[PDB]
Write a protein that binds this ligand. Structure first.
Ligand SMILES: Nc1ncnc2c1ncn2[C@@H]1O[C@H](COP(=O)(O)OP(=O)(O)OP(=O)(O)O)[C@@H](O)[C@H]1O
Ligand SMILES: [Mg+2]
Length: 603
């Protein structure tokens, strides 16, 4: 069968499919190209999904679940979930394992069983159009999702009876929808995604060589707490302050009124993106001892812009960081893509256009670009789309320099991404206070034959003998392919870190050379590791005795570089007889000859 693309949003979901060569966004059973991400369980035992559920949320607040993406994959005691516990009108509870679950009519349900209801409708939407079963899907997630959030989204898919063939970040999906059928030429794009639940920004390179289009992320970030929800709650606060001032009542203590007020405020926000003024009209919004009370408040676009301007101006500073991290100026960005329903606000479009100096592209639909890109990825997996290349694996092994100029691999070539691997190293010399984490890319055993991706220092290590300190080095490649290298001194807690650009990378011409070069040199590289491993067990023991005095000692400095194992192993036996004939509050003594298997770092 077909592999469908689903944009699984906080607020809205969308299903798309490849129709031979062109993607088509599908209308649900109600004639809508998007479906609200809302699931409701009614008193008479039915499960409503989408617009039918949205329409009755205000009359059935306890049993209508929405914004489950804020909970899926999170622990119940996370502060973000606890803040969420108070404000949401449905019951959020701790599962037996501490996960954040929800409770409806006495049934405890996991967030993925709830999101699966939207996916069952998305699967059904596609099956009605195609006339055959659907079982495979590509589903999108925000770029800030961690490992657990990604697992939970896949889990939701399995419960909906869909096999989730691939997960791809939402900004990457948006670039794929735009990158089919693009006006030819290499372009740099900025994807500005402001949805109901979060802001995410990406800098994405779309290149073209021999008819094949490749997609590479140069930087990505955002703000996980700016979204259409936060625009609403600025308007909500204004209406509360205006009503308190006009009628002396604070609505915040009237749950029935606040549910009505949040929906009225959101529809007003939306309406003011198209009109210059609007009226919020809520009869019987509350009551006190003197009878019913009624709200009728005028909100102009100028007033609205005043309430939320601060949120938009704070979204600009994350773009500058993305440019710093991509090493680019605004002037190198050739196109801007607006994604997300909240970007339809004119102040947002104007404010973004002002930063980049160019008008955002008008042929990318902000509610649909992500789902279409998800459909594109599905078509690549079936082979139906061929001018698309997404690299989901490391092209080359990645590692660090360890004592003796050796490349030590932390993540092997062709490992599926995202992935994360750590290993603990130590210091190479007595009383060494710092180590230089030297990051390398390539297949050779000599560090000097590989590509340097960058380096950094970690300081503050206590004077101690070699091999006694513990330095944890972690390589993390995120799903969008960006490499984060960190180093941590485990006994003190100190940490230093770097991010490594794609530009400091190696190209396909160069990747194929590194692979061809290494196989031809397999025995020679093995020989270098062998004469290193012994060279360094030997300079192991003259550092150990120059410090012990405080002699063929200049003759073993010679016979370390003389590339022979038994040549150093003789200058071992030679100063092993120039030596064989003639406990306080700090580190510990030797007293025996054992050493440890932990690899060593220069610094
Ligand atoms: N016409 C509009 N003008 C301005 N804002 C709008 C408009 N239409 C939708 N919004 C706002 O956009 C938000 C929904 O955006 P969207 O449907 O793209 O979010 P989503 O993809 O579900 O969210 P997320 O990307 O975090 O998962 C809503 O909170 C809504 O208030
Ligand atoms: Mg979205």
């Amino acid at each position: 069968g077909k592999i469908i693309g689903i944009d699984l949003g906080t607020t809205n979901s969308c299903v798309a499919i490849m129709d031979g060569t062109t993607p088509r966004v599908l209308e649900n059973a109600e004639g809508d190209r998007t479906t609200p991400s809302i699931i409701a369980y009614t008193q008479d035992g039915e499960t409503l999904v989408g617009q039918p559920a949205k329409r009755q949320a205000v009359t059935n607040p306890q049993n209508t679940l929405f914004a489950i993406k804020r909970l899926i994959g999170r622990r119940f005691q996370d502060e973000e979930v606890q803040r969420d516990v108070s404000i949401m009108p449905f019951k959020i509870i701790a599962a037996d394992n501490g996960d954040a679950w929800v409770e409806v009519k006495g049934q405890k349900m996991a967030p993925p069983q709830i999101s699966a209801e939207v996916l069952k409708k998305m699967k059904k939407t596609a099956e009605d159009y195609l006339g055959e079963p659907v079982t495979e899907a590509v589903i999108t997630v925000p770029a800030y999702f961690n490992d657990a959030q990604r697992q939970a989204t896949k889990d939701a898919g399995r419960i909906a009876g869909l096999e989730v063939k691939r997960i791809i970040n939402e900004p990457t999906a948006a670039a794929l929808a735009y990158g089919l059928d693009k006006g030819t030429g290499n372009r740099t794009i900025a994807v500005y995604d402001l949805g109901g639940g979060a802001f995410d920004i990406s800098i994405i390179e779309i290149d073209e060589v021999d008819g094949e289009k490749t997609f590479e992320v140069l930087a990505t970030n955002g703000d996980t707490h700016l979204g259409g929800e936060d625009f609403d709650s600025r308007l909500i606060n204004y209406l509360v302050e205006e009503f308190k001032k006009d009628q002396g009542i604070d609505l915040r203590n009237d749950p029935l009124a606040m549910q009505r007020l949040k929906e009225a405020a959101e529809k007003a926000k939306i309406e003011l993106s198209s009109a210059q003024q609007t009226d919020v009209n809520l009869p019987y919004i509350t009551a006190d001892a003197t009878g019913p009370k009624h709200m009728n408040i005028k909100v102009t676009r100028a007033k609205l812009e005043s309430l939320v301007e601060d949120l938009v101006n704070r979204s600009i500073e994350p773009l500058k960081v993305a440019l710093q991290d991509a090493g680019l100026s605004v002037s190198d960005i050739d196109d801007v893509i607006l994604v997300g329903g909240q970007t339809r606000m004119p102040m947002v479009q104007k404010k973004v256009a002002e930063f980049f100096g160019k008008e955002p592209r008008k042929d990318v639909n902000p509610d649909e670009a992500v789902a279409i890109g998800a459909a594109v990825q599905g078509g690549v997996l079936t082979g139906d789309v061929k001018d698309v290349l997404l690299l989901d694996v490391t092209p080359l092994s990645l590692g660090i320099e360890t004592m003796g100029g050796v490349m030590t691999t932390l993540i092997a070539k062709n490992t599926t991404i995202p992935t994360k691997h750590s290993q603990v190293f130590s210091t190479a010399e007595d009383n060494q206070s710092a180590v230089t984490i030297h990051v390398l890319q390539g297949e050779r055993k000599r560090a000097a034959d590989n590509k340097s991706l960058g380096q950094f220092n970690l300081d503050g290590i206590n004077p101690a003998p070699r091999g006694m300190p513990q330095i944890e080095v972690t390589f993390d490649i995120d799903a969008d392919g960006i490499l984060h290298v960190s180093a941590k001194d485990k006994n003190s807690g100190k940490e230093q870190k770097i991010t490594i650009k794609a530009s400091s990378g190696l190209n396909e011409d160069e990747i194929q050379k590194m692979v061809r070069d290494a196989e031809a040199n397999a025995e020679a590289d093995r020989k270098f590791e062998e004469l290193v491993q012994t060279r360094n067990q030997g300079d192991h023991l003259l550092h150990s005795t120059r410090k012990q005095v405080e002699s063929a000692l200049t003759a073993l400095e010679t016979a370390l570089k003389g590339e022979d194992k038994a040549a150093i192993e003789a200058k071992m036996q030679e100063l092993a007889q120039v030596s064989q004939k003639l406990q306080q509050g700090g580190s510990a003594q030797q007293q025996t000859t054992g050493s440890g298997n932990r690899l060593l770092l220069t610094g």
